[PDB]
Amino acid sequence: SVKPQLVMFTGGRDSTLAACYLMLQGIPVHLWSGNSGCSLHRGILSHRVEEMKNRFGDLVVGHTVADISGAFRSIAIEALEQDILKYRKNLVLLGEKLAIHAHLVDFCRRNDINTINDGITHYQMEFPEQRLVAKTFLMEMMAQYDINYQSPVYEFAQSADDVKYRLLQLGISTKSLEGISIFADSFSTPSDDVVLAYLREKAPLAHNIVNFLAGETLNPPV
Amino acid sequence: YSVKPQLVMFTGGRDSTLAACYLMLQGIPVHLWSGNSGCSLHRGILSHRVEEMKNRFGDLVVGHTVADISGAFRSIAIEALEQDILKYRKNLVLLGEKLAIHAHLVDFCRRNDINTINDGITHYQMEFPEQRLVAKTFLMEMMAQYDINYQSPVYEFAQSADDVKYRLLQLGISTKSLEGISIFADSFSTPSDDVVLAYLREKAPLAHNIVNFLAGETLNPP
Amino acid sequence: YSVKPQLVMFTGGRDSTLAACYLMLQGIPVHLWSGNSGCSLHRGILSHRVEEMKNRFGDLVVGHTVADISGAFRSIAIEALEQDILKYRKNLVLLGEKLAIHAHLVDFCRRNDINTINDGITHYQMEFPEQRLVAKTFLMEMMAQYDINYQSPVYEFAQSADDVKYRLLQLGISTKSLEGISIFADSFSTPSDDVVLAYLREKAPLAHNIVNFLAGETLNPP
Amino acid sequence: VKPQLVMFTGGRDSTLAACYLMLQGIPVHLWSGNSGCSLHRGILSHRVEEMKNRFGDLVVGHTVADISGAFRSIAIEALEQDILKYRKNLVLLGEKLAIHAHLVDFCRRNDINTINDGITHYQMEFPEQRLVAKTFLMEMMAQYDINYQSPVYEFAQSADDVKYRLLQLGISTKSLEGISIFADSFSTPSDDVVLAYLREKAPLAHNIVNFLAGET
Amino acid sequence: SVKPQLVMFTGGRDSTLAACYLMLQGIPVHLWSGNSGCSLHRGILSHRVEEMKNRFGDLVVGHTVADISGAFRSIAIEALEQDILKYRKNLVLLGEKLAIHAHLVDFCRRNDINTINDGITHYQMEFPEQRLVAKTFLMEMMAQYDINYQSPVYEFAQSADDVKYRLLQLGISTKSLEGISIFADSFSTPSDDVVLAYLREKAPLAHNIVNFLAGETLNPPV
Amino acid sequence: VKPQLVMFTGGRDSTLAACYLMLQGIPVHLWSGNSGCSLHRGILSHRVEEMKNRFGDLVVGHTVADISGAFRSIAIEALEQDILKYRKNLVLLGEKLAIHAHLVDFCRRNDINTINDGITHYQMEFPEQRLVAKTFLMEMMAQYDINYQSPVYEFAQSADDVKYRLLQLGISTKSLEGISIFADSFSTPSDDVVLAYLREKAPLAHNIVNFLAGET
Amino acid sequence: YSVKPQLVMFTGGRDSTLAACYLMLQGIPVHLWSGNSGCSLHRGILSHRVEEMKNRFGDLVVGHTVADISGAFRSIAIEALEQDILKYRKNLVLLGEKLAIHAHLVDFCRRNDINTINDGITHYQMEFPEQRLVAKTFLMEMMAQYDINYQSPVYEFAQSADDVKYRLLQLGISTKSLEGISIFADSFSTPSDDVVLAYLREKAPLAHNIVNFLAGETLNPP
C-alpha cells in the first residue's frame, strides 16, 4: 500500500541508516547501487544487504546494481586533464554523483519511482558530493524531471557516532561495508564555488546522457 | 506488441550494435539479422555481443537470425569472378555480398511481416562501396520496390568511431567490434561510383531472380 | 608401430578416401589431414566418411586433423585477388589454396615426424590446375626441399570415376564424394600451364615465408 | 494447403523438387521406397534434417516403405525372360512401377491426391526418367484419380541447374542418397523397349494395387 | 586348445547343423555371415545364434557379419545383361558364393583361420552353389591359398528331414531362420557345364578382389 | 625450455608476441594485471582459449593479478600534483610501472627470469610504448636480474602486420581486451615528460617491490 | 466406422498369417487365436510373426490369445491312444487336437462375443486331414450348432505355397513358417475319409461335453 521509494545505497552506515529509517516508517525501499568501474573490494556489500533483509523483510523491495561506468567516464574521466588544470582539484567523485543522478532520472522514469533518497551526512560535508551546494543543485536537477530528491539522515548525523549507535539499536553492524573507490584520498578539499562551477559545467553532458538513455537523441550537447 | 518490430542488419560491429540499441531505447523491438556468406572468419565472438544486448534490453531483442546466404553470394559475386574483375578492373565481391544480403531480406521481411529494416552504416566509414551513398541509394530503391523501408538510424550521428564507442559505453555495452572478418577484407582497391553503380545494375536481375525463387514463384534464371 | 604412419590429404572425396584405404590395406597407418580454408560450404558430411573408414580399418586410422589454413590462404591467394586476376587474366584462387595447404603440411610433417604425404589426385580429374602434372611436379619439388616425400597412390589407377567408386564399394565404403564445396567451385576458366607455373613461382616466396613463421624462425615478410 | 507427396531419394533433384513445393507454401509428405537392394542409405537422414531445418512444419512426415516384395514380383521374379526378350536390364524401371503401385495404396489410405518426383531432362538416358515412362505413369496414376507431377523436370537442363538453386536454399548440393546395387549394371534401352516392358508388367502392377487395397 | 574353424553360417538348418556337428566334436567355430545387400527379413537370424550359444557356449567363438555387397556387385550384378544373354540363366546366387569365398580368403589370412566349412547338402544339389562341380572348383580355389574348404553335412543330408531331426536331438529348432534373397525363385536350374563355365569366367575377378583386399593391387584383372 | 612470462591483455600485439614465443618451443606463463579500473574484461577468456587450442601445453598458466593498490599509490594518490606539474594525464604510464614492480615480485617468487610484452612501433604515441619508457623499464628490470623483451616491437610497423600473422595461426585478428576507463582521457606527452614521471615514481615503485618481498 | 472383430486360427504359418493379413487389408479387425496343446516344440518364434503383423496393420490386430488346450487335447486324443490306434489303424492324434481347438473356440467365442472364425486353408495340401471336405463339413456343423460362422477367406486365393509366400512378401512380411512343431509331426500314415469322419463322430460327444464344462453347465462326463 505505500509507494516504494529508492535509496542510493552503497553499503555505508549512512545510506544503510537512511534506508532503515524509511523502512521503520513503513516506506518500502528499492536499494540502488551504482558501479562506476573503479570500486575495489565490493563483495562485503552483500553481508550488509542480508542484515537489512533480516531486519525489515518485505520493505526491502529490491536491490539494483547498475553499470554507470560510461556516464561516469563521459562526465568525469574523459576531460580529466582539462578538469584538473582548470579547477586545480580532482573532482572525479563529484562527477560520479552527477552520473548517478543522470542514471536515476532514467531509472525513475522507467520504473515509476518519483522519490529518491541518499545518505549524505552533515559530518561528511568536506566531500563535494555532500556539500549543501551540491545537494541544492541536485535537488533542482531532479525536480526538473518531477523527481523528489531527499536526504533523510542529513540533518541528524552531526557525527559518525550518531549513525553508528542508531544502527546498533536496529541490530545492524556499525561498520561501513562498502567498496572503496580507487580515487579515495586522491583529492584535496575544494571550495563551494568550485563544486558548484564543476556541476554547472558538467550539467549539459549529464542532461544529454539522460536524453540518450530515454532514446530521444544520439547527438552531443551543443 | 506496443510497437511493430523492425529488423536490424546486425554484424556484431559497434555501429550496428548502436543502431539496434538506439531503436530499443525508443521502445522499438528489433529482430537482429546476421548474414553468413560462407567466407567469414572467427564469427564466434558475435554471441558475446548478442548477450550484452539481451542483458541490457531484454524482451526488446525479439530474436537473432543467422541466415545462410552463401548460395545467393556465389551466384551474384563469385561464380563470374574472373569476368567481373576483368570487366570493372575492381574486386567488387563485397558489393555483391550486400546485394545477396538484400535479396534475402526481401524474402525474410515478406515472410515475417517486417517492413522496416535498419543498418549501422556510418558517415565515418564511407570509403567502402557498401556504405557509399550511391550503393545505399540504390538499395533503398530496391527495398522500396517491395514496400520495404530502409533506414540508417546512426548514419548522421556517427562522425567518428569514438562517438559510437562511448555512447555504447554509456549503455553498459563494450566498445569493441565483435564481428567476424571477411576473407575478402583488404582485397580490393577503391572503385569509382560509376563502377559501383554499373556492377549493381548488372547484378540486380540476378538479385531479383533470387527473390522470386525464395518466394516460390519461379525456378528459371533471369 | 610396425609401420611408420603416413599422412593423406583427405577431403572426404572418393579419390582421397580410396588413397587412404589403399595404404591401410597394405598395413600403412594413415593420419588423415583436412585443410579448412574458410570458404567451404556444407562440410558436415565429412564426418560420415571418417566413420565409415574407422569402422573398416580401426587402429590404422591414427587420426583426423582439420587445420584452419584460412590465414595462409588469404595471404597467398585472396589479399591480392585484383592484382592476381588482372595479371594472369585467370582466377587461380584454388591453386593458391593448394600452396597454402602445402605450407601448412611442411609445418605439420616436421612437428609430427611424418615424411611421406599422399593425396588422391587422379588422372581422370586433370582439367583442374591443382591436379595437372605441372602443379604436382612443382609441389613435389617444394615438399622435397623439406625432405618430405609426396606420393599420389591412386593416380595411375584411376582412369575414371567408376573405377574408384566400385573399389570403395568392395571395401564396404559408400561411393559418394562426401566433401564440402568451395565457394569458388566453377568460378574459373581453364588456364595454360605457363600461367599455372608463373603463379606458383610468384606465390612460392609467400608460401616459404609462412613455413618459416609457423616454425617460429621469423616474423618478417619475404 | 493440402499436403502433397514427394518421392524422395535424398538426391539433389528430388530434394529440389520437394523444396520448391514448400517454397510455394505446399506441405510435403516425404516418401522413400526401400526395394531391398539399396546400399549405404544412412546419408539420407542428414538430407532430411537439412530440409526440416530450412522448411520446418512444411515437411509433414517421412515414410520409408518396404516395397521389396512388389519389386521382386515385377522386376526380379522373371529376370531371365525379361533380359532374354528385352536384351536390356530393366530392373530399375520395374522399381519405378512398383513404387507407383504402392503409391496408389498409400495415397488412397492417406488422403493424398498429388505425388511428385524429381525426374529431370538431363537424366533422360534412364528409363524411369524418359518422357515415354513418365507419360505412362501419368496415365496410370490418373486411372486412380491421382495426379503425378515432376516439379523440376522442365527446369533441370543439367545437374548444375539443380545444384545452384539448392545452394540458394542453404542445402548441400551433392546427392545424399543410397545407391542401387544395380547401378551401372545395364545398357541404354530404346523407347520401344521401355514402353513395352511397362505395358507387360502393368497388369501385375494393378493386381498388387488391388491386393494392397483388399480386393485380390 | 583346439584350433577354431570358420563356418559359413546363414541361420539355415544345414549350416546350423554343420556348425553344431563340429562343436559336438570339440571344434570351436567362428560363425561367418555374408550380407550381399539383397537379403530380406534377416532379423530372425539372432534367435538362431542364441539357441547355439545356449547349447555349446564357449565353442561359439564369435559371429562376424560381413558387408560383401561390393564383391557381389562386381562378380554377379555389374555384367548381369551379358551374363544372362550368354548363359540363358540367372546365376547371381552362384556369383554370391564366389564373392563369399573371395572375402573368406582375405578373412582367413587376416585372422589365422585355415579351415572353412559350409552347410551345402546333397538334397539341395539343384542349386548351383551346392553342386559337386561348384564345390570341387571352390575347394581348388581355397587350396591355392592353403585354406581347407570342407562341407561337414554334405554326404549325410540326403533329405531335409535328416537335418531337421538331428537338430531336434540337440534341442535346436528345425526351421530355417535365415533371410531370403530377393533373388529366391528368380532362376531356372542350370546344367553343370554352365555352372562350371560361369565360375571359370568370374574367377579372375574373384582373385583380383582377393588381391585388392590384401592391398597388393588396385588394377582390374587383365 | 624455461617458461617465460608475457604481459597479456588479450590484445592482438600481446597475443602475437606470446604466440611467437610458443612457436619457438618456449613456454609462456600468461600474466594480466587488473588495475581496478578496467571495463568489459570478459572477452579475454575467449582469447586465452584460442591460444590453448593452438599451442596446448606451451601455454603454461594464466595469472590475473590484483595490482590496483600499487597502481593507486603510483598513479592515482597524487593525481592533482601529477596533472598540475606534467600538464598530462600519465595514469597509464604509472600503470606500466606498477605492472613491472609487481612483476619483480612475481618473477622472484616463481623462478622466471624473462618477461615479455607486446608494445609495438606503430603505437608509439602512447607513453607505455615509447622507446624512452621501454629503455627505462629495461634498465629497471635488469637491476633485479630480470630480462624484459618486447618480441614484436620491431616487426609491428602497423596494426596490419600483427593481424595477418595472427590469421596465419587460426586466431582472430581483433583486440579481445578490456578497456581502461582512462582510455581517450589524455593528450600526447613529450619524451621529457615521460622520462621525468618515471624517474619520480620509480622510488615509490622500488619501495613496493621491497614491501611485496618482505623487506619494507 | 470399423467392423465387428473376427477370430483367425493363427499358428504363425504363412497360410494363417495370410488369412489374417487378407482380412485386415479389407478393414476387418482380427483376434489372433493360437492353441497350445502341450506337445509343441520351439514355439518362441511365433511372437516374431505377431510383431511383423502389428507393425504392418496396427490396431487391426486386436489381440493375440495363446490358450492352454492341453487338457481337452489329452481327454480327446491321448487318454485312449491305444484303443484309438488299434481301432482305426491310424494315429489320428492331430485330428483330435483340432477337435480340442474347436471345443475351446466355442467357449472363447461365446465369452468374447465373436461369432465369425477363420482358418488359413489356401491351396490343396494333402498332409492335413482336417482340410478335406469331410472334416471341414463336420467342423462347420459343430461351430454352427453354437451359432458360430466358420469361414475360409483365402481358400484358393493362392494356387501354390510359393504364391502364399510372395503375397506375404508384397505386404512386407517374411515368407517363413514361424510356428512350433508338434512332437507328433510325421508320426502317422494317411487315413481314409471314412476313418477321419468316424473318429470325429466318436470324439464329438467328448468335445461337446468339454464345451459344457467350460461354460459351467456340468461336471459329469459324457
Side-chain angles (χ1 to χ4, degrees), chain A residues 16 21-22 30 32 43 51 59 69 82 98 108-109 113 115 117 140 149 159 161 166 174 200 204 222:
Chain A
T16 299
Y21 184 63
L22 293 168
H30 203 311
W32 187 99
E51 292 185 288
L59 290 172
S69 58
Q82 301 98 298
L98 189 53
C108 292
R109 280 169 160 184
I113 294 163
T115 306
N117 301 265
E140 151 61 355
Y149 171 28
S159 150
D161 287 348
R166 283 290 192 202
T174 55
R200 290 166 168 179
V222 277

Side-chain angles (χ1 to χ4, degrees), chain C residues 41-42 45 48 52 162 166 169 172-179, chain D residues 39-40 43 46 50 167 170-172 174-177 179 183-184:
Chain C
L41 314 180
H42 311 288
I45 55 181
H48 185 87
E52 287 195 298
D162 278 4
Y166 292 124
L169 201 71
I173 291 165
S174 64
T175 55
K176 295 291 186 173
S177 273
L178 302 170
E179 58 192 330
Chain D
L39 315 169
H40 310 286
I43 34 207
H46 189 269
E50 298 207 308
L167 276 194
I171 287 155
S172 51
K174 303 227 148 174
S175 267
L176 321 177
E177 43 165 30
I179 84 151
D184 319 301

Side-chain angles (χ1 to χ4, degrees), chain F residues 127-188:
Chain F
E128 60 281 24
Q129 312 211 192
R130 304 225 187 136
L131 179 67
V132 73
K134 167 174 203 294
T135 295
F136 180 93
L137 294 181
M138 276 177 66
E139 269 160 13
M140 178 185 140
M141 299 294 122
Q143 289 164 354
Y144 299 112
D145 296 321
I146 290 158
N147 180 356
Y148 165 37
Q149 295 280 314
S150 297
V152 302
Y153 180 65
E154 304 263 291
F155 149 92
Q157 294 295 307
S158 62
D160 287 344
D161 302 304
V162 171
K163 294 183 194 173
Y164 73 92
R165 279 306 208 207
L166 265 182
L167 276 194
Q168 301 177 1
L169 283 179
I171 287 155
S172 51
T173 218
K174 303 227 148 174
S175 267
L176 321 177
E177 43 165 30
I179 84 151
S180 198
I181 205 183
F182 294 109
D184 319 301
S185 73
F186 52 87
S187 45
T188 328

